[PDB]
Design a protein around this ligand. Structure first.
Ligand SMILES: CN1CCN(Cc2ccc(NCc3cccc(F)c3)cc2)CC1
Ligand SMILES: CN1CCN(Cc2ccc(NCc3cccc(F)c3)cc2)CC1
Ligand SMILES: CCCCCCCCCCCCCC(=O)O
Ligand SMILES: CCCCCCCCCCCCCC(=O)O
Lengths: 178, 251, 280, 59, 251, 280, 59
């Protein structure tokens, strides 16, 4: 990414194979690079344990004449992440229809064997994966751009909580400031 | 507004923003088997959220020359999630279904699709007299295509679209539960089918409960545009499913 | 009655939810309004009834900021040729240490009492002749509000504090401790100040303009050994009875100046192979 | 002066402590870290017209 | 008479005519998870009769030189009926078990077996320091054999019988729930184990809840006779099983 | 009422028994049921009435585990060429010391509060020139929950703890002490874990997988003498408010690894001349 | 806050002590080593059907 602002936009095209993946990421809010520096990751990095559900909100920023459907799925922890939409839809998922309402919310449920999870997550306290796939594809009329973008928003539900204050590792100094 | 609908089954949800209302079979909602109508003696198993959930089938391309497609159930879901496992491991089955078909296009496209569920859609062979294996009409989740001309190969079903492979007028299929997907005002169709059969339960591998058909009655058309085809996707979800007769697996 | 029994709040529970089919669409919303969706997992999928006993006690601002943190350290010798090297003079401020600075800068305005603790240690400087006998040392900590006289040498007259508070501490005992009230002329401390000092938009710019808390001075009371001895003081601050307003995003770039916001541009975050890579 | 109040403990599983103040300045008292009231509406729902989650956000 | 017992789970039944009574774990009967102790949010699935039923494991031969065997659960049932499928397709699991071991011999045979369920039976490697794959202690339903002498191969667990692979006196295993099969007066042992763990639920493929051990403390003996060995069979049945966290299958 | 009078259990008494002749046979039983006989001496022989005042107060788990025990010791020098030798870094665990390890491993699951006490002593290293004068030393104990920054040298910035709890202690006073609550993510500590880390039954195996308690760091605050000085720290744990589940037989073989159950086969017990020998 | 309770002593041969808590965390309290309840049935009598000592174990 030569331009930093590109990091916030998920590309989308008009003509794509029938089933194709839009994006994929690990659900490690306090350790994954994606969520590391978000407003939620920064707060989490001051603690050691966390629990509760999360909200992922997606907004379509294409033309008003564009249309399409997307499948967003959450896969609990397992030995292998999903590779195709066929595997992906077996887990928790929602079908998103783009219309007058430009935003959809995927609520990631709290499914864990322990009451809490480590911010410095490991194999024992893994949390799963999140992926998005083309459900129908994007169709545009004549005289419109051939590409669009999507943005993702992250936040915590009303049952979220943290524990065990600690010092964050993102900030450090070598000499006394003057 | 009544153009927005939301359906939640198990751990899956479907949201549509442009949609007509929902057709409910013959006015009957799916339900469990009563005690005064059952015949099997042993206790049934009612996997609930594990099996009553939405499954996405493969998607198809709608071209300018498409003629139609059909799917046969529950053979289509025979190898999907835990529903397939329960089908394999049990002798008897019973379940309703909810079918959601999706097709979206811009305001500059035109076309019309007929979505209909045909119970007991017995089909005739291409050559009158000869017979066919159980592969020319059902091979899993793959879709089978109608044909504009009269079929000639003796190993497959008669695919004449205007007869619908049943020897009846294609325009009279309106009698069955159905909906239309008109690109002007609609993007999806929703049908809820209760369990329809002459016996309380049945083997899900031996008998096809009903057939789903999608037929373009107004062929797709567009001009200019970079979009060359309109994908079509089908989603299904068993409802109030229960099984009985645990034997070994393997169908 | 000689005793008054002053004598909590758990997170929301999860209610049970069944299959639904209706025109309501909780999942669909519009972020353009600036409104954060209030949906819960019970609206998108079937859920069981669960009673949560988790509490957010440890996430309150009082507990978050209620930890002692180092803010300054300096060394001063008991005897040396340079007069300026035998005592310390520090203008009070919280921008010197990065961890506490970042912790405080998550809010725009603060109002709290302060608890100050001093840790003092001594060590003998290396040299040829180290054989000596020296009694226990004593130290004086002097606080000079703004505008007061400032000592210029270890044995200056200003060390005879008559109104300036001071603490005398002897090595080997517990660290000195003391409390200080909310001493801002305004209604609350301001971590950031977007403005100038002069009325014609000129002069000092930034929070430096509002730093008028005073100075702290430290010396050896009368210790002057035949051989040099070095002492180090560490100052720890601990807010109490805290209140905060207008939260702001945490800083991303490394600090570079003690009285400015200057920084160098930094990447938003780290990179990965591609948008689909999910493996380690 | 004696001030008795409960202490933090676990859920569904005496818990009282006594406190007395010795100094004449309120700033000398110990931290009051027993308050757990919170209200996220100021930052999560700053809109003027109330929005119902079930109903569509717009129209 | 109290020497006859009958147990009926699902569509299977066990009848014994010579038997001691039944030991119930630590005095606690298996039960479903309460609402005030659960942590997962979504609805669980409670396949009932489909999974709560008796499964027969392979049988073993008891010779004059046998030393003992052990099995690890639920890895032993990992590939049995619909229980295995539910284990594969779910992230979390929880279930009690009923274990019935059977050994019958004439009145002229002599011998004694100890049947015990050891929760969290962590085992040490044959060579102190080296490690072993997850194949030297669990490979499905097959039984693993103890050894009279000290194990020497570095790729397997220390099988010294007198230490039981845990560094403890074999004679002190009486502390765990157990029964004795004495050929004089007994033919089978029945143990009911509630779900024991430090968390409400757990991954059934990653964690071994408990280990079953059969140890001959009085070696088999007989004279003359045409019978050369005494078969031993183990039957298990999950109870109050429930699952959660539907992901893709494949463990 | 400003006072609440919260304000025991002796062993069973022996009842008198006379001659008996009946069909009841208390002495005869069947161990095959897994049931331990509940007979008493009064059932097999004539006995007098005796009132027992003995109590089992000292056998409760609370008292059995309620004793401070050493769990770790390490040495660190005030000054040396090697940077790693001037401070300690210990991953917290209870498997290092054999006595406490065996005491804890008699139960499968535990749940308790902890009381930690630190004992620190110093001594001057041998050398030619020992003549020096050094003031009293001070030490810092730092606790870093998992995932936090770790210091890499004695004078690292991480020693400016702003959220990490720490203790500053001066030689000559009472040993430092502090309490810590039940800090397990699960519902109880697990001494044994028969399972793997990865979902495909691979990776780390054993209780090592569940050890995520953090680290402890110790250093001399600012002491740096002309000649080396060595200090030793001892950590003592003392469970409080204890609860235990699923007792298991005590270990028989000697421990050989700090994070594994590996062992060498051992004889069941010692031998004697023959089955009838009863003399010394 | 004052909490008065008896202290351990001998048999057939005042014994009260006072305790007060000073900290706001229950973990700071002293060990509660005054509980002497016990029940060995869970390990000594884990059978399903109740067995009478006088009657024969089997039949
Ligand atoms: C420009 N403002 C200055 C105050 N700063 C917060 C602050 C930090 C430390 C203090 N210390 C006050 C104090 C407390 C006790 C003794 C003293 F000499 C001084 C006051 C305010 C925010 C930015
Ligand atoms: C794998 N588990 C780890 C915990 N172990 C019991 C245990 C021992 C010591 C502790 N100490 C916790 C503690 C307490 C106080 C300060 C600390 F830094 C850490 C916790 C649990 C059993 C085996
Ligand atoms: C400077 C105050 C010193 C207090 C000494 C300890 C308390 C002695 C009195 C007993 C407590 C009663 C206090 C009250 O009446 O509120
Ligand atoms: C932080 C608590 C300090 C307590 C000082 C000693 C007790 C003084 C008050 C006399 C005892 C009465 C206590 C009570 O009312 O419960």
């Amino acid at each position: 990414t030569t331009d930093q602002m590109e990091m916030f936009r998920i590309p989308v095209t008009i003509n794509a194979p029938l089933q194709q993946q839009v994006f994929g990421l690990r659900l490690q809010p306090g350790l994954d690079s994606v969520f590391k520096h978000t407003l939620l990751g920064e707060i989490l990095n001051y603690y050691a344990h966390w629990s509760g559900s999360m909200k992922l909100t997606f907004v379509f920023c294409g033309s008003a004449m564009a249309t399409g459907k997307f499948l967003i799925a959450y896969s609990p922890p397992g030995a292998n992440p999903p590779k195709t939409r066929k595997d992906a839809m077996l887990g928790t998922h929602i079908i998103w229809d783009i219309g007058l309402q430009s935003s959809c919310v995927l609520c990631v449920p709290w499914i864990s064997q322990t009451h809490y999870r480590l911010v410095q997550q490991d194999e024992y306290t893994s949390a799963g994966y999140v992926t998005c796939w083309y459900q129908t594809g994007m169709i545009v009329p004549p005289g419109t751009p051939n590409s669009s973008s999507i943005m993702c928003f992250a936040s915590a539900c009303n049952d979220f909580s943290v524990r065990m204050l600690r010092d964050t590792p993102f900030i450090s100094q070598d000499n006394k400031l003057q | 507004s009544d153009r927005v609908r939301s359906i939640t089954l198990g751990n899956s949800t479907i949201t549509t923003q442009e949609c007509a209302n929902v057709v409910v079979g013959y006015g009957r909602w799916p339900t469990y088997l009563r005690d005064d109508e059952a015949t099997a003696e042993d206790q049934p198993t009612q996997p609930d959220v594990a099996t009553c959930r939405f499954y996405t089938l493969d998607s198809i391309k709608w071209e300018k020359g498409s003629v139609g497609w059909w799917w046969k159930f529950p053979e289509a879901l025979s190898d999907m999630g835990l529903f397939g496992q329960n089908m394999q491991y049990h002798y008897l089955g019973r379940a309703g279904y909810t079918i959601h078909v999706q097709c979206n296009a811009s305001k500059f496209h035109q076309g019309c699709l007929l979505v209909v569920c045909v119970p007991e859609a017995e089909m005739g062979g291409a050559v009158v007299g000869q017979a066919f294996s159980a592969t020319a009409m059902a091979n899993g989740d793959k879709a089978y295509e109608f044909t504009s001309a009269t079929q000639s190969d003796q190993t497959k079903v008669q695919t004449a679209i205007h007869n619908a492979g049943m020897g009846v007028g294609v325009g009279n299929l309106t009698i069955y539960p159905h909906q239309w997907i008109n690109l002007r005002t609609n993007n999806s169709a929703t049908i809820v089918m209760p369990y329809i059969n002459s016996v309380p339960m049945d083997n899900m591998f031996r008998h096809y409960n009903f057939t789903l058909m999608v037929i373009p009655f107004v062929k797709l058309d567009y001009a200019d545009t970079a979009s060359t085809y309109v994908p079509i996707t089908v989603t299904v979800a068993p409802m109030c499913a229960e099984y009985n007769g645990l034997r070994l697996a393997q169908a | 009655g000689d005793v008054e029994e002053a004598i909590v709040v758990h997170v929301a529970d999860t209610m049970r939810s069944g299959p639904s089919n209706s025109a309501s669409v909780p999942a669909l919303t519009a972020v353009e309004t600036g409104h954060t969706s209030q949906v819960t997992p019970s609206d998108t999928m079937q859920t069981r009834h669960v009673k949560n006993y988790h509490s957010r006690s440890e996430s309150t601002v009082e507990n978050f900021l209620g930890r002692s943190a180092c803010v300054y350290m300096e060394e001063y010798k008991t005897t040396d040729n340079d007069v300026n090297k035998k005592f310390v003079a520090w203008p009070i401020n919280t921008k010197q240490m990065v961890q506490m600075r970042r912790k405080l800068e998550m809010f725009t305005y603060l109002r709290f009492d302060m608890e100050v603790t001093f840790v003092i240690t001594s060590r003998q400087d290396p040299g040829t002749t180290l054989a000596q006998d020296m009694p226990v040392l004593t130290h004086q900590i002097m606080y000079v509000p703004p505008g007061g006289p400032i000592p210029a040498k270890v044995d200056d007259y200003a060390w005879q504090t008559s109104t300036n508070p001071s603490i005398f501490w002897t090595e080997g005992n517990a660290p000195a401790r003391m409390s200080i009230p909310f001493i801002s002329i305004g209604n609350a401390y301001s971590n950031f100040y977007d403005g100038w000092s002069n009325f014609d938009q000129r002069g000092s710019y930034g929070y430096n303009t509002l730093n008028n808390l005073g100075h702290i001075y430290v010396r050896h009371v009368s210790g002057s050994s035949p051989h040099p001895i070095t002492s180090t003081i560490r100052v720890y601050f601990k807010p109490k009875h805290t209140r905060a307003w207008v939260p702001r995003p945490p800083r991303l770039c490394q600090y570079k100046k003690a009285f400015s916001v200057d920084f160098t541009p930094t990447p938003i975050t780290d990179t990965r192979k591609d948008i689909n890579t999910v493996t380690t | 002066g004696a001030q008795v109040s409960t202490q933090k403990t676990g859920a569904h599983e005496i818990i009282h402590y006594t406190n007395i103040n010795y100094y004449k300045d309120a700033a000398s008292n110990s931290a009051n870290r027993q308050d757990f009231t919170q209200d996220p509406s100021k930052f999560t729902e700053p809109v003027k017209d109330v929005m119902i989650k079930s109903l569509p956000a717009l129209n």
